[PDB]
Amino acid sequence: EREIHPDTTPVYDRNRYVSNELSNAKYNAVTFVPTLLYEQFKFFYNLYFLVVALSQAVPALRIGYLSSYIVPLAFVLTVTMAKEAIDDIQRRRRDRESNNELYHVITRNRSIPSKDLKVGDLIKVHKGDRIPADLVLLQSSEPSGESFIKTDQLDGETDWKLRVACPLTQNLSENDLINRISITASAPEKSIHKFLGKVTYKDSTSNPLSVDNTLWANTVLASSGFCIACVVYTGRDTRQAMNTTTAKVKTGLLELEINSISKILCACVFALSILLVAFAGFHNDDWYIDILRYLILFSTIIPVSLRVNLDLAKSVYAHQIEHDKTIPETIVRTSTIPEDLGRIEYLLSDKTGTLTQNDMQLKKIHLGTVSYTSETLDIVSDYVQSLVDMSFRVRDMILTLAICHNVTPTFEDDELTYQAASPDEIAIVKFTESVGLSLFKRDRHSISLLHEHSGKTLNYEILQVFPFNSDSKRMGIIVRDEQLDEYWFMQKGADTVMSKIVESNDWLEEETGNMAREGLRTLVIGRKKLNKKIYEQFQKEYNDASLSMLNRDQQMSQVITKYLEHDLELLGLTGVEDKLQKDVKSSIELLRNAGIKIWMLTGDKVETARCVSISAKLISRGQYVHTITKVTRPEGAFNQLEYLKINRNACLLIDGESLGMFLKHYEQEFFDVVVHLPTVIACRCTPQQKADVALVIRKMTGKRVCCIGDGGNDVSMIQCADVGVGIVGKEGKQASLAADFSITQFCHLTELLLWHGRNSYKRSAKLAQFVMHRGLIIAICQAVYSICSLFEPIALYQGWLMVGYATCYTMAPVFSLTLDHDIEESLTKIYPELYKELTEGKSLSYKTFFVWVLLSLFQGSVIQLFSQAFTSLLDTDFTRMVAISFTALVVNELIMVALEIYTWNKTMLVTEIATLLFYIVSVPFLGDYFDLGYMTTVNYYAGLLVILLISIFPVWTAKAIYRRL
Ligand SMILES: CCCCCCCC/C=C\CCCCCCCC(=O)OC[C@H](COP(=O)(O)O[C@H]1[C@H](O)[C@@H](O)[C@H](OP(=O)(O)O)[C@@H](O)[C@H]1O)OC(=O)CCCCCCC/C=C\CCCCCCCC
Ligand code: BEF
């Protein structure tokens, strides 16, 4: 439905149509906590500390100070809520910058910004004015023709689309246009190639509307004066918003691993409590309450400290990412999953924006005996300047390059600009202009040049034109010169098709083979000289062959083959290139060397995809490069079967429809094939299919899938991907406004993954190691005391020492791990292989958690038993035993932190000593009610030395042995 009339003031919004601000907002305040709380409190490693601190609801379970349980619970809750709210408001602030762009309007008022622009308010978009919503172009810049919009940031196609103003709206003028014109459009739907509706005028006047009559979403107007359009859809009705899935919160692999080991740790301490209660036997005979009490005692430190440490180390990780000057302006969007980087194994990359700047130029031109590079412009320049032995080759090559195309230049000011249907033509004409034979004027029935040096202006009359078309790959024109009465035909197209029409060309195959190896978009050009009457003979034949209503249109092809394109002289071939992002062709090599199966997923065409892939070293110097294009229906399984037969070592290049079919019916079989390949490339992939592939890879292989992109083409992938990165590109930011991370170019990803991610993961792993170690050591010490004296475990370290060990005395060196560096900043590039060592669960598997358990058990057992050996269990010596136990326990952590530190930074060497000397100011100063004997005699410190020596010698020796081996 949707009858839209200008003069929408009576129903201006008024809930009749949505507003145009596409905010990336989360958690409306009326449902902020009800969502965040129920989200974070479902994982066991959080529910554990919640259930611990929610004890003391029954008085029988009061293990100690209510402060020890409520305080840290509130601390973690408030810190998590604050971080989440800060991230949300920061995203809203950053998004506000693009929501209220300023758009000149014609209905009323001065220019009003977006979020005030709504259905049907005419926008006089200018030049590079990013379109705000879905438009219907009612009037162009008055060329009596069309206007161009480039889809660089909507579907990724690198070629500008053709859009034509509606036929009846070029004459109405503003007065009748505003008053009552009316239009209608179909209800919003997916896809970026369909449209339906009608324009309307007084009485029954009506005309059809088609995809070429509309400008969509963030498509950017290109190379034109201005145009008048009335928005049709807006507010999540755009073709950009409709093709994008709802955002979902994501969780880190490190969080999952810590949950999986916290399950085991809870089971372990529950088993220890059961053992203690059953061993004692006579503990009140209400053994269930006693095992519950012991469980609550043993669980008071580990999980609640783990959440604090992780959530306050994520802040350091995010600050380090956001602050580094080697990756400047890489502001992070999602504070969570900063450590997930470092365990990435797949990387689905976009082509347009991330890889190619969509800038193009004639890198090199070859025309037979020699070749000319862009740097050697001087020779061709002085050759062409004399246009008005090899001169007859080069001059005519350039004179044909400057005339055989579809470009149309226009002047907005003293400078000219190019409106053309393809960057290939744009670059060809730009090269001609640079070498001095600039195109200066264009129109039906006339093509002209402006000549440098001599200042002459050349005028040619195009007699017929054969536009570029798919499955033809040839474009040519018949040119009638009038400076000299000569007729010409000049043709341009793909070598694979033209090579059958060119002269002997004994060198063309060799040159093309050595040309395309660099990924250049090879094109060949030829000519033929005609006369006046022969053109008339051709026209008679072509006019007859153009008979309408007859199903013999191939007569025209036969005529052109007979007369025009049979023996074209070979002027030469030209190599157009895609300007890759800085340092891409080595960054890809580094990433692949680290073990990441870098793929390519693009919305572009197959030829350009292959050319960019070959240019970027994504395909090795020699590979099969299998092609699977336009396969439909299930019967394409023979392609995958032949791929298995080919036995790997053969890159795959697949069309978007083929990928969509294979991922639709042959999910598992296709995945089992593509997994072992070194690289996959997709072409013409719609925004949904990239997200589908990203989901399927993770679902099927378990590995983690990075995704990098820019523009609304990749929002659906970045949201459904892991650690999804966005690039804030020129002329648009919508992708970075929704990505998890942001970077100004693709070169940054090398450092963002190999160094920041790896260091984050290692820091978090070792920090969790130490937290669990310092929890289990005290748990084991209390359990050993209960075993060896039959007293309740809570007797040892009773009072303020539990708080002082949970926090304060020993938090600082444990947090100090998050400032270490595994390797220098620079040495990441020289040894990319290091990142591969994390490919397996080498840091948080049960096989390592149990080793930590054994080491903590030994440490605590030695501590407690040797304290008892150097003291007595009698209550007379309790205040001495507790001291020789607790001080040794604290020094245990303050020594083991220094034992497992890789590089000694200034902060660590300060904080370790500053917490040891804080403990020395601790209970030995105001703690006399516990942990106090004489504590000065030599027999005390000798025993402490012996305990510490026997405690650390195994870890020191093991570290030495396993660093020697
Ligand atoms: C509407 C919602 C309502 C909620 C409101 C809040 C309720 C109460 C708040 C808190 C409760 C208790 C928790 C206390 C901790 C607070 C932690 C935190 O929340 O995070 C905030 C900063 C982040 O840093 P900032 O302080 O914001 O300032 C930074 C900017 O973040 C940073 O962006 C700027 O640089 P770029 O990154 O942008 O380039 C920077 O200039 C500042 O503006 O948390 C932290 O500060 C985390 C700790 C920081 C790490 C410190 C050590 C590590 C760094 C480097 C190591 C190098 C070695 C040094 C050697 C020493 C030689 C002398
Ligand atoms: F090249 Be993608 F569409 F940003």
Author numbering: 154 to 541, 561 to 1137
What does the article say, verbatim?
In budding yeast, NEO1 is required for neomycin resistance and encodes a phospholipid flippase that establishes membrane asymmetry. Neo1 and Drs2 are Golgi-localized PS/PE flippases, orthologous to human ATP9A/B and ATP8A1/2, respectively, required to establish plasma membrane PS/PE asymmetry. In cells deficient for Neo1/ATP9A, the extracellular PI4P is a receptor that concentrates neomycin on the cell surface and facilitates cellular entry of this aminoglycoside antibiotic. In addition to the previously described PS and PE flippase activity, Neo1/ATP9A also functions as a PI4P flippase, transporting PI4P from the lumenal leaflet of the Golgi to the cytosolic leaflet. Here, we describe a mechanism by which the P4-ATPase Neo1 in budding yeast and the orthologous ATP9A in human cells confer neomycin resistance by preventing PI4P secretion to the extracellular leaflet of the plasma membrane.
The cryo-EM structure of Neo1 in the E2P state with bound PI4P provides further insight into substrate selection and transport mechanisms by P4-ATPases. We observed a lipid-like EM density that fits well with a modelled PI4P. PI4P is at the substrate exit site, representing a post-flipping PI4P in Neo1. Interestingly, the lipid entry site is closed, similar to the closed entry site observed in the Neo1 E2P structure previously determined in detergents. The headgroup of PI4P resides in a large cavity next to TM4, with the terminal phosphate forming hydrogen bonds with a pair of histidine residues (His472 and His476) (Neo1-PI4P). Glu475 forms two hydrogen bonds with the PI4P headgroup to stabilize the substrate further. PI4P binds in the same exit site position and orientation observed for substrate lipid bound in the Dnf1-Lem3 flippase. Thus, the PI4P binding site in Neo1 is within the substrate translocation pathway and is on the opposite side of the membrane domain relative to the PI4P binding site in Drs2. By contrast, the PI4P binding is weaker in Neo1, perhaps evolved for facile substrate release into the membrane. Consistent with a flippase–substrate interaction, the neo1-H472A E475A double mutant causes a loss of PI4P asymmetry and hypersensitivity to neomycin.
